[PDB]
Structure 1
Amino acid sequence: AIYADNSYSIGNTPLVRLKHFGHNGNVVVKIEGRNPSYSVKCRIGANMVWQAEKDGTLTKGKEIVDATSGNTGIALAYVAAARGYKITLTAPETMSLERKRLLCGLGVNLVLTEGAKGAKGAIAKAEEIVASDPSRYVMLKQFENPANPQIHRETTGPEIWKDTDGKVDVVVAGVGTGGSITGISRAIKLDFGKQITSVAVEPVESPVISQTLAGEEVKPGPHKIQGIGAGFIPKNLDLSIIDRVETVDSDTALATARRLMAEEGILAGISSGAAVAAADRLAKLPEFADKLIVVILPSASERYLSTALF
Structure 2
Amino acid sequence: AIYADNSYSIGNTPLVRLKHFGHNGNVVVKIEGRNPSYSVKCRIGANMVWQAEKDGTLTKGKEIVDATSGNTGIALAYVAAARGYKITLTMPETMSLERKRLLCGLGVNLVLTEGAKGMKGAIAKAEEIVASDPSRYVMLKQFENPANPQIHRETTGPEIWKDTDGKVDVVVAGVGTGGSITGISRAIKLDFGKQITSVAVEPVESPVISQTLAGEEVKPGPHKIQGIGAGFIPKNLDLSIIDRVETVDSDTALATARRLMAEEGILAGISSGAAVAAADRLAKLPEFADKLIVVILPSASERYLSTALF
The answer to whether TM tops 0.5 is yes
Whole-Å Cα distance in 1 between the matches of residues 159 and 20 of structure 2? 24
What are the superposed Cα offsets for residues 37-73 of structure 1, whole Å, 9 maximum, x if unpaired?
0000000000000000000000001000000000000
Aligned to 1:236: 236
Q: Distance in 1 between matches of 2:259 and 2:69?
A: 27
Structure 1: 4+ residue segments shifted above 6 A: none
1:258 Cα deviation after fit: 0.0
Aligned partner of residue 296 in structure 2, secondary structure: strand
Local SS of the residue matching 2:172: strand
Structure 2 SS opposite 1:3: coil
- CA distance in 1 between counterparts of 2:29 and 2:253 reads 15
CA distance in 2, matches of 1:173, 1:61: 37
Match of 1:66 in 2: 66
- What SS does structure 1 have at the residue aligned with 2:144? coil
Distance 1:235 1:296 in 2: 20
Q: Please state how far the C-alpha of 1:104 moved relative to its aligned partner.
A: 0.1
- Paired residue secondary structure (1:37): coil
Separation (CA, whole Å) in 2 of partners of 1:60 and 1:15: 37
CA distance in 2, matches of 1:285, 1:291: 10
Whole-angstrom CA distance in 1 between matches of 2:171 and 2:300: 20
Distance 2:118 2:296 in 1: 28
* Matched position secondary structure for 2:294: strand
**C-alpha displacement of 1:276:** 0.1
Residue 25 (str. 1) matches residue 51 (str. 2): no
Give the share of equivalent positions with the same residue, in percent.
99
2:112 paired residue number:
112
Instruction: Give, in angstroms, the shift of residue 155 of structure 1.
Output: 0.1
Kindly state the Cα deviation for residue 184 of structure 1 after the two structures are TM-superposed. 0.1
Secondary structure at 1:2 match in 2: coil
Describe the SS at the equivalent of 1:169: strand
Question: Where does residue 145 of structure 1 map in the other structure?
Answer: 145
* Residue 157 of structure 1: how far off its partner (Å): 0.1
Per-residue Cα deviation, 1:137-179 (whole angstroms, up to 9, x for no partner):
0000000000000000000000000000000000000000000
Q: How do 1:133-212 residues align onto structure 2 when only pairs under 5 Å count? A: 133-212=133-212
> Could you tell me which residue of structure 1 aligns to residue 276 of structure 2?
276
Give the paired residue count.
310
CA distance in 2, matches of 1:234, 1:94: 26
SS at structure 2 position matched to 1:112 = strand
SS of equivalent residue, structure 2 residue 152: helix
**SS of the residue 2:202 aligns to:** strand
User: Equivalents in 2 of 1:291, 1:58: separation in Å?
Assistant: 44
The alignment partner of 1:95 has SS state of: coil
Deviation at 1:13, TM superposition (A): 0.0
Once the two structures are TM-superposed, the CA of residue 231 in structure 1 deviates from its matched residue by 0.2
Alignment deviations for residues 242-294 of structure 1 (CA, whole Å, 9 cap, x no partner): 00000000000000000000000000000000000000000000000010000
Q: Secondary structure at the match of 1:111?
A: strand
Cα displacement (A) at 1:234: 0.1
Correspondences of 1:216-235 after superposition (within 5 Å): 216-235=216-235
Please list the CA deviations of residues 177-215 of structure 1 after superposition, one character each: whole Å capped at 9, or x if unmatched.
000000000000000000000000000000000000000
Deviations 1:79-125 (A, max 9, x none): 00000000000000010000000000000000000011111100000
For residues 171 and 92 of structure 2, the distance between their equivalents in structure 1, rounded to whole angstroms, comes to 34
Separation in structure 1 between the aligned mates of residue 237 and residue 85 of structure 2, nearest angstrom: 29
Q: Matched residues in 2 for 1:3 and 1:14: separation? A: 19
CA distance in 2, matches of 1:302, 1:61: 34
Instruction: Tell me the TM-score normalised to structure 1 length.
Output: 1.00
Post-superposition CA distance 1:198-243 (Å, at most 9, x none): 0000000000000000000000000000000000000000000000
CA distance in 2, matches of 1:224, 1:134: 35
Distance (whole Å) between structure 2 residues aligned to residue 205 and residue 274 of structure 1:
12
Query: What SS does the corresponding residue of 2:193 show, helix, strand or coil?
Result: coil
- Provide the C-alpha distance between the structure 2 equivalents of 1:66 and 1:183, rounded to a whole number of angstroms: 23
User: Equivalents in 2 of 1:212, 1:289: separation in Å?
Assistant: 30
Instruction: Report SS of the residue matched to 2:225.
Output: coil
Gaps of 5+ in 2: none
State the TM-score, normalized to the length of structure 2.
Answer: 1.00
1:24 is displaced (CA, Å) by: 0.1
SS of equivalent residue, structure 1 residue 91: strand
CA distance in 2, matches of 1:278, 1:228: 14
Structure 1 CA distance for aligned equivalents of residues 99 and 133 of structure 2: 28
